[PDB]
Amino acid sequence: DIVADHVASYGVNLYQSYGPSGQYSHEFDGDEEFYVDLERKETVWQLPLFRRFRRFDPQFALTNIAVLKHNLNCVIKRSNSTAATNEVPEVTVFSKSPVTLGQPNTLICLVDNIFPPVVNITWLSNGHSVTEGVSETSFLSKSDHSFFKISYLTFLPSDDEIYDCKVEHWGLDEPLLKHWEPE
Template sequence: MERKPCSRGAQLGLWACLWGAAAVASLQEEPLPLFSQVFFCQRDSPFFGLAQVLDGDQLFWFDFPSACWQSRLPDFQPEVPSRMPLGNVSTQQELCQRLLAIFTNLSEEQLPEAKGIPQVDVFIRHPLELGKANTLICSVSNLFPPSAVITWAQNGEPVTQGVSTAPVSPVGGLKFELFSYLEVTPRKGDVYSCSVRTPGDEHNGLAYWVPNDPVPSDFLETLACGAAIAVGILFVLLGSILIAKSHMSQRTE
């Protein structure tokens, strides 16, 4: 029996079906938001940590000294039923301490200690204006175990005033991140540094930040106006050339 080729309409219908199936498959493959709760204990400070995270972004963390939940963003309400009750937190603390002692005795001097190499970066929160108050942010990523001491310095001198450090935050796997903030008034010639030391390490992670001269806003406005005028003149010239060529071709004909 002779087979007839598919009509163009049938081919289009087949392609539409395949495209629709691919679109449904791609929608099904999109990852769903991942909400996780991370509890840890260790021999170095902070000795305990508890956080609730959505897609790697910390939403809430438990303040163990104050025995209460805290929210990373002020608009969030930490004291709601979805937070772990205080009684359960105490139970988790005891269990974690017991497991830590057991695994420490089993692995000490037999297994190498897992460690991450902290990556340190310093950046400014708001656009730089020399002589105006701003905030420097020291970001520490790839932190494991989740323990580190951050120190700030200005022109080589230690700085302790205007410093605040957030609790460590889990970001997935065995990685944590840490942020420290320094209130500053940048001036020309200043050199700021953020130093990170982890337990047992002889060398610090270090990052510097130097205020570069910002471009004055009035200069940017003048530059933008000049560029706009130049573009306008260019279009006028192109239009005049096209009109002249059109007239020349009409005369030739």
Template sequence: EGSAPPLFNSETFYVFVYIVLFLVHKGHHLVGCSDTEREDMYGLDGEEIYYYNFNKNKAVVAIPEFADSVSFRFPTDFEPCVYSTKIYLKCKSVSIYFPVFTDPPQTSIYPRDDVVVSVENTLICHVTGFFPPPVRVSWSKNNVNVTENITLSQYRPSSDGTYNLFSMLKIIPLEGETYSCTVNHKALQQPQTKIWDVEAVLPGIGPSAFCGVGLTLGLFGVVTGAYFCIKAHTNCSQLSLMSDCTTVKTC
């Protein structure tokens, strides 16, 4: 019979999504697993609410603390994923074929805040429209791989059945630096890379420039107002003189 194959393939991320439709909103519960990744996440309208961090063995709240806390049972929901995957692999082993369609990701890179030199910021790499998971995201700075200060979101289902994901890199931008985000996915013939160059405002120049422009406009307004005031006074004086002359002639 030979040795049994591993339960999971690291290149395949088995996903089970449970969707609950409300009158206005759409809630979802996503559970996924592979040899190297595990995910158990609750979301609403495509956004994360709670997820379980399997590396740290704790639940993570992904929404602001603006309401009473709601608890979920983690990671007990993950066990059905493992069980269902075992059943799926057994079915597949007896020649039941499920066609797998793939969609390549679309990638964009942008800063979270307005960029100011030497001021901490966050670069965001948004990977969307891919199927199936997983994707691999890597960062580089000036063509050198970066492995620190990186955070990765959970896989989020989209309304069209594809998935999206965010990768974030904390940076302190300096003039002339170049950052890149590279995405690998089975539907891509080659890795997809997006490049971002630091084009920033030097500290202090922005506020000073606005202040200078405001001061100039203010002075221009004062001079313009004084000009019209003097002109009006002169016209009034001339009209008064003409009125006096008319009175004398009439007499």
């Protein structure tokens, strides 16, 4: 509906009773500029460019999330405790860069259509749980008010190792696995 050269979210604000937990982030043209670590009261910028030239007061996020908590309790009362519906996430795995054996790379696991925003994303290497070299985005907003989240695995392509992205979510009957390997 809204045509624009650029779109920013200068507050994606989230609070949920499970935990409870929250998230505060800014987005520009669909990518996450920062989130605020609400426990540590720290703004965590997502690019070195941003870390050196930008600043955001973490108390702004803390204050806003406190308002959401207040608002949430009002709307629970007004809705007779209407709970969130669990949606079925969609999972895709692809590489960051063209694959050549022996050349360090990154695998990307996109977990889309997440709701509610509670998920476990982990990696398997030859069936083994991966403990290092994993990072992930925050929850990224969607115009239908679900979320997506992206996890990253650093890896060394080889002829003897294969990968799965493993996703746990209340909308799934069992853990969902998405497979990837160098062809």
